[PDB]
Amino acid sequence: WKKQAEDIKKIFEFKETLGTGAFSEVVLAEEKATGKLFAVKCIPKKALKGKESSIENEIAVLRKIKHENIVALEDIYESPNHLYLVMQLVSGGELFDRIVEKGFYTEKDASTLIRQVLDAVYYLHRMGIVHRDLKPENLLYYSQDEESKIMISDFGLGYVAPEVLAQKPYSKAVDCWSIGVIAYILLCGYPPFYDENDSKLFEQILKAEYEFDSPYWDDISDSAKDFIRNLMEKDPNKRYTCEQAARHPWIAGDTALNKNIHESVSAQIRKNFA
Ligand SMILES: CC(C)(C#N)c1cc(Nc2nc(N3CCC[C@H](N)C3)ncc2C(N)=O)cc(C(C)(C)C#N)c1
């Protein structure tokens, strides 16, 4: 299943870095043989020492599975000192850019986005993967047009749950908290927790102290607010799972409103982010 290369440069031309992690880099790559573009995750094998077999066994499982809302793992190359995970290039645009660029945006649009993220994350959880880094930056559109699906663009083999901040044991439920935070930002354009003081911010997240403040939340449905409260729940035992959230009427039913909330959401995205 793993392709072997003496030098990955025999296969790919590397262009700009898309993301930099701890001993992982995602780079735009062109396959020299075809001209096709990919996002290639470059990993030094020395960084995997003691878990190489385990990580490869997991990649071997995921290479065979495509989820509509997750970057496909297209190929794996092994060089003498690196692994290269050849991923689908998700080229349709960034999440916040799209919302700002739209002239018209409703709760139904936000619900549609969250439904896709719930589907993707439910699947990762079934496979034993806790994403741990769900945030707008990891969500990209497949295509530039208005019907494009959203995709989780990257995953590991302010948005962090209170139990993680409390250095307590944590589970897949941390992802459900993060999805609630994303839903919050999608309906008002600003984060639910922020303070210039990190200590105050830490305490607000630990206590799950947030509000649906006026005027930004006045024309948002009770159903949306209930949906968010069930995910942004301090107690991971009480917190909705992805499965429970997918059954809530705001996702599965017809309670998401049809009001154009673009003006306020786009103004707040512009004002609250760089
Ligand atoms: C080259 C371009 C214009 C296209 N086509 C483009 C493609 C992507 N694509 C990906 N970006 C990432 N990362 C960046 C986001 C956070 C994540 N942790 C790592 N990882 C995987 C993919 C993928 N699967 O395509 C990203 C950007 C930029 C950098 C502008 C953004 N955002 C630009």
What letter would DSSP give residue 46? G
Q: What are residue 85's DSSP bridge partners?
A: 41, 76
Q: Is 180 annotated as a binding residue?
A: no
Catalytic residue among 119, 133, 145, 235: 133
Asked whether the bond before 80 is cis by omega within 30 degrees of 0, the reply is no
Helix ranges (DSSP H) in the chain: 52-62, 95-101, 107-126, 162-165, 173-188, 198-206, 222-231, 242-247, 249-252, 262-272
**Which atom of ligand 1 lies closest to the CA of 15?**
1
Q: Is 25 annotated as a binding residue?
A: yes
CA distance linking residue 94 with residue 123, whole number of Å: 23
Q: Are 266 and 99 in contact (CB under 8 A)?
A: yes
| Side chain identity, residue 164 | V
> Per-residue b/e over 35-65, b at no fewer than 16 CB within 10 Å?
eebbbbbbbebeebeeeeeeebeebeebbee
**What are the φ/ψ torsions at residue 5 (nearest 5 degrees)?**
-135, 135
CA distance linking residue 39 with residue 29, whole number of Å: 6
Cited resolution, angstroms: 1.5
Q: How was this structure determined?
A: X-ray
Active site residue 109: no
What token pair was written down for 260? Answer: 């154009």
- Ligand 1: lining residues by beta carbon, under 6 Å: 18-19, 26, 28, 39, 71, 87-91, 94, 137-138, 140, 153-154
92 HSE (CA, 13 A, CB side): 22
What token pair was written down for 103? Answer: 């002239």
What letter would DSSP give residue 60? H
Q: Is 19 annotated as a binding residue?
A: yes
State in Å: Cα 140 to ligand 1 middle: 8
What token pair was written down for 208? Answer: 């799950």
CA-based nearest residue to 239, from 200, 181, 192, 185: 181
Taking CA atoms only, the protein residue closest to ligand 1 atom 19 is 19
214-to-217, 255, 264, 272 alpha-carbon distances in Å: 5, 21, 12, 16
Farthest-apart Cα atoms in the chain, separation:
60
**Residues in contact with 38: Cβ distance below 8 Å, sequence separation at least 6, in sequence order:** 12, 28, 29, 30, 31, 74, 86, 87, 88, 89
State in Å: Cα 97 to ligand 1 middle: 13
What token pair was written down for 191? Answer: 């984060």
At residue 94's C-alpha, the angle toward residues 197 and 109, to 5°, is 95
Taking CA atoms only, the protein residue closest to ligand 1 atom 7 is 91
265-to-127, 140, 255 alpha-carbon distances in Å: 35, 19, 19
CB atoms within 10 A of CB 20: 10
**Residues in contact with 147: Cβ distance below 8 Å, sequence separation at least 6, in sequence order:** none
Q: Is 22 annotated as a binding residue?
A: yes
What letter would DSSP give residue 45? G
**What are the φ/ψ torsions at residue 41 (nearest 5 degrees)?**
-85, 120
At residue 229's C-alpha, the angle toward residues 223 and 231, to 5°, is 110
What token pair was written down for 101? Answer: 């660029």
Task: Tell me whether strands 3-4 and 73-78 are parallel, antiparallel or unpaired.
Answer: parallel
